[PDB]
Amino acid sequence: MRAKWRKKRTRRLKRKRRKVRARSK
Amino acid sequence: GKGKPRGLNSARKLRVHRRNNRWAENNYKKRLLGTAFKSSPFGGSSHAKGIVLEKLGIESKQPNSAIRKCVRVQLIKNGKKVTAFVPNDGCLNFVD
Amino acid sequence: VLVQDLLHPTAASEARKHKLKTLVQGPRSYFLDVKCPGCLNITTVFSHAQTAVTCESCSTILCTPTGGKAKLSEGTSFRRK
Amino acid sequence: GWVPVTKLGRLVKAGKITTIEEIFLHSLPVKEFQIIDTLLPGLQDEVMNIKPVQKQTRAGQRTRFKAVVVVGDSNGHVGLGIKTAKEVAGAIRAGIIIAKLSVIPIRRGYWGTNLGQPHSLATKTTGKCGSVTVRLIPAPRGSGIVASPAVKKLLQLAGVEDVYTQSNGKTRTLENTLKAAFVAIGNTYGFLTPNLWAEQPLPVSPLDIYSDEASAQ
Amino acid sequence: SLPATFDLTPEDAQLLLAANTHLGARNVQVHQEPYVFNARPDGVHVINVGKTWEKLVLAARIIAAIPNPEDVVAISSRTFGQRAVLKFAAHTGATPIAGRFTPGSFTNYITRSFKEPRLVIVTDPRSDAQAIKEASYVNIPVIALTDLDSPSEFVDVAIPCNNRGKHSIGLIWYLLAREVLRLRGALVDRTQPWSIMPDLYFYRDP
Amino acid sequence: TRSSVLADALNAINNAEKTGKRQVLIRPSSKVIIKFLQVMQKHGYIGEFEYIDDHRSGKIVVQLNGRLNKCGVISPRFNVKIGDIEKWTANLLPARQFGYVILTTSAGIMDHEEARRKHVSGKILGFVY
Amino acid sequence: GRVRTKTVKRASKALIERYYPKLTLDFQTNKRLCDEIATIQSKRLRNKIAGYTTHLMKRIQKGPVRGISFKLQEEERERKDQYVPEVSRSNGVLNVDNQTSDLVKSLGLKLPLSVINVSA
Amino acid sequence: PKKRASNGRNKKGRGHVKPVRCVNCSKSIPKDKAIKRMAIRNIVEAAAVRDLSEASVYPEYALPKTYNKLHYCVSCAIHARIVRVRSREDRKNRAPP
Amino acid sequence: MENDKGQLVELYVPRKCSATNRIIKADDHASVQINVAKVDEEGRAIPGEYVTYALSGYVRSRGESDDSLNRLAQNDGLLKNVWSYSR
RNA sequence: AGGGGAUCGAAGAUGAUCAGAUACCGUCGUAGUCUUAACCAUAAACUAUGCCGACUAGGGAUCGGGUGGUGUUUUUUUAAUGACCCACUCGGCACCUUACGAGAAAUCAAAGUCUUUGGGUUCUGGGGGGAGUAUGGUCGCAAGGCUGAAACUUAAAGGAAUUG
Ligand SMILES: [Mg+2]
Ligand SMILES: [Mg+2]
Ligand SMILES: [Mg+2]
Ligand SMILES: [Mg+2]
Ligand SMILES: [Mg+2]
Ligand SMILES: [Mg+2]
Ligand SMILES: [Mg+2]
Ligand SMILES: [Mg+2]
Ligand SMILES: [Mg+2]
Ligand SMILES: [Mg+2]
Ligand SMILES: [Mg+2]
Ligand SMILES: [Mg+2]
Ligand SMILES: [Mg+2]
Ligand SMILES: [Zn+2]
Ligand SMILES: [Zn+2]
């Protein structure tokens, strides 16, 4: 998959793990 | 001169810089991080002696086709569980 | 080429080179003595002006500056040394 | 029967030239392999490596066969033949021929002292074919030839008794390494050492002295 | 060994200026040419023809001095040099080559153009560049008729001349053939204007 | 900016020989350059050379024969102790029978065999073969 | 489309090469030559061969033809060689540039002197 | 690998030119990477010139051609205009023909 | 290239280029030897007598074979001017 | 956060096309596009090519400075100028041909002067994937930026060139 889209993939994937973690802050 | 400082007084930079890039060596890193002692089922020991939990037929990878007959083992100094192959036709009838 | 005399180069091809690329470097600029028959005596001028040089007694003109050797003014003569 | 062409071919069969060192002295190019046969009978070949290569043709597939041969005595003459042909025997035949034309001399020498009969090299020589550099270093007597078995045989045929070697590149490609070691030994006689500073008179050509006893009909 | 009166005489000096052999190439000048004498205004450079005559004497000095005169190869692929070399070849030993060179002549014994000369003479190392290249594989010396732009790689002993056309080629080859007969040869004494006419060279017409 | 005046000298000399010339103009000479050029010439690797005097640091015209394969400068001047001169010559010299490492002792700029005879040691300048 | 093969044009080459003082521009006699002088395997190849050597013969009589030089022409051109008497010491003096004449006085001596200037 | 020494086209010592829009597909494109064809053509054509003066006032009139500069996008220049494609060697030649 | 006691060992002392004093070695087939024969009273090029020069293939390839030959011959006296040591 | 908001136009909605068509094409058009005040700090931010110095090779154009000329064109009365022409010299943006030389090649006046290995200095890389992920620190309003692992997995991944 396009490197750019593969990058946007984990950009999203990170902001979500960022989310779930802060719910336990 | 492309890079490395050639001056007579540059030793400090020279060892510092080499000390740095040794970490790209896989073995130097492993030996100093103590990955032997930290990770890995054996302690860094040559061998380790566990106890057989189950017996597994393992499905072999391509482009082979076979059933590899291993044993799940719990290391006695560890409790770490490990799957291990039993070589030489038969020899699965040798364990239990 | 491939063999030649770097110690005694021809005076023709030393003359075309840059003033720093000669065999022993030196200037290409000269000094001159200028007169404008209104005045009897002669001021000495550098070939490359910068300052616009005025004569001894009367304020007249001599040369205006340039990016280079000064343009001398109108009726004038010059010797060189 | 031979039946030469090339004025140089005649003059050798004409018995007017005894040794190839004459030919090297005058840099005369050899086109007739029989020249270096009569000039060097004691040549023994060695077939160094044979490997298949493959071309894709608009009809079919050609897999021909590449062979690498090395000839020499062991007195200071070697040659590197490499030939590709669609039969292993045929490629070896033509390869030994090219190894003939290619023969070049070697300047041996003494390690550290002036004693009997040079066992080693005049200088350090390096040569590089493709990606490989083979470096040849003067060595004490009885050090042997220190080289991988391929390079060792090319050096042994060349006549070298004791030499140190080092290589750099992809040396597992056997073809580029030998062409490099060949260029390495071939460079011993391009190296100007003080003993060769003495001026020689410039000898007269065999193509002139024997000029009448050469040329054509 | 400077002979005596082998100097360039006005009998010859007139000849050269007649064909404009002194009139050199235009703006193009290879850095390899001291052979100039000042420069004419408007594009032209004057060739120093004593250095031409002195070189032509040296070419003659090498041409003769080949034990068998018949392998000394004169070459022109130019049309203006073919009438000359054939007329050079006839007078001296000199196996000629005119027209097409057929590369692979000095390598490749198998060809039917095959020569093996101990010397080579060439009119235009641009047009004849194949010959110059081919000789440099086999250790073959090369004389050359060279203008101010000529590619002096792999030519020794260049004869500065004008290959822009006309009678110069014919002239230089006429003098070259003339001076190799005056050397060791069947020719004669000093002034010796030499019976053969100089227009016997010169690619003709139309 | 110029970090070794010796360096640019030796390099330019080598580009003469490599390009097949018979002479080279080096700049801006020096005391160290001269005594280097002397050690070469006194074993014959170059011909006569001429210091020309600009009122600046100087120039040199070296005449070279073509017996010279390489001259080069060891750029950090390492200290050599009398038994490591073995290891220097062995590294960069073509063979044990000729060629010299030239170094700087308190006994002055001298080649390595003169150093071995006079039994002084020092730093290392360069080499010539 | 009638285009002779190489074997035909190749054999005509060697034939006119060495047998020119024989043959002719008549096909019929050349045909009979190729029997007595040459070994061909069929009547058709021979008439084809001979028919083309007749054509190559027919045009050699006017102008040379590439591929056949029987060495007879090279000494036909040697005996054909002459031209001139005019040359090129008339009329008057040699007209030279300025520097051309300066080139004379530098190394030289008496030369007829006519000089011109030119321009940009 | 690298297939041109001019890279796309004709930019050395700038680092930014300014884009133009392609006449055909409107695709923006650097001015020096574009491909320009001057369109100079008479207003009328081959045919209508004779019937022009025939129906026209004035002797012979004037005939004022129209000039407009064309800018193509590569891909649009390729689809029609100066392209073909060239051999590895024939590419180098900048000769217009 | 002598040996322990005196004896010449190591076959084949090579030629040398006349311009550069650099060895000419067997596989340089771009090298050259120019034979210039001596003359005598009133023409007459004297077969079997030469002043010879050997120029390495290097120099010939670099385009210096001509101008380098002038210097060589003129210094041996078979040219008078044509060559200038200054530029 | 104000202003501006002609144009074009992420989003969204539409007309088509499609098996489908969340698209490519057509329409509408929000944000945006412009500006001020302040953030952000990233681009194939590319010459995918650190900087200073030296040396090694030819050629014709050209931009800027300068020097030389009983040069051309400008008429007036010669000039003075200006624009031009020709030669040289610095310092640029590039092209051309060479290849001594370098390279795995493509190619390269540097990517050269390198096993004949040392002018000065900064930085980065050490099989592929894991992964620019986790974690800590730090900067940011945010989007995110800098710093940045390991476990495990794996015999290739990759570069240039050749023939199909
Ligand atoms: Mg909560
Ligand atoms: Mg890392
Ligand atoms: Mg389990
Ligand atoms: Mg315990
Ligand atoms: Mg093997
Ligand atoms: Mg691609
Ligand atoms: Mg940019
Ligand atoms: Mg939508
Ligand atoms: Mg829809
Ligand atoms: Mg579709
Ligand atoms: Mg970045
Ligand atoms: Mg003027
Ligand atoms: Mg596998
Ligand atoms: Zn005044
Ligand atoms: Zn477009």
Numbering used by the authors:
A (entry chain Q1): 1 to 25
B (entry chain D3): 2 to 97
C (entry chain D7): 2 to 82
D (entry chain S2): 34 to 250
E (entry chain S0): 2 to 207
F (entry chain D2): 2 to 130
G (entry chain C7): 2 to 89, 95 to 126
H (entry chain D6): 2 to 98
What is written in the article reporting this PDB entry?
Ribosomes are one of the most conserved molecular assemblies, and at the same time they are the target of many antibiotics. Amicoumacin A is an isocoumarin antibiotic that was found among secondary metabolites of a number of soil and marine bacteria. Amicoumacin A is the universal translation inhibitor since its binding pocket in the E-site of the small ribosomal subunit is highly conserved. In contrast, it inhibits eukaryotic ribosome movement along mRNA during the elongation stage of protein synthesis in a similar way as it does with bacterial ribosome.
The structure of the amicoumacin A complex with yeast ribosomes was determined by X-ray crystallography at resolution up to 3.1 Å. We prepared the crystals of 80S ribosome as described and introduced amicoumacin A by soaking at concentration 200 μM during post-crystallization treatment. The amicoumacin A molecule was located in the E-site of small ribosomal subunit after manual inspection of the peaks of positive electron density. Amicoumacin A interacts mostly with rRNA residues in helixes 23 and 24. It is involved in stacking with G904 (G693 in bacteria) in the tip of h 23. The antibiotic is located within the hydrogen bond distance from 2′-OH of ribose of U999 (U788), oxygen of the phosphate group of U1769 (U1506), and from Watson-Crick edges of nucleotides A1005 (A794) and C1006 (C795). Otherwise, the conformation adopted by amicoumacin A in bacterial and in eukaryotic ribosomes is very similar. A small shift in the position of 2,3-dihydroxy-5-aminohexandiamide tail can be attributed to the absence of mRNA in the present model. C-terminal amino acid of yeast ribosomal protein uS11 is located at 3.6 Å from the isobutyl group of amicoumacin A. Mutations of uS11 make yeast ribosomes resistant to the inhibition by cryptopleurine and emetine26. A conserved loop of the ribosomal protein uS7 is located 3.9 Å from the isocoumarin part of amicoumacin A in the bacterial ribosome and is more than 10 Å away in the yeast 80S structure.
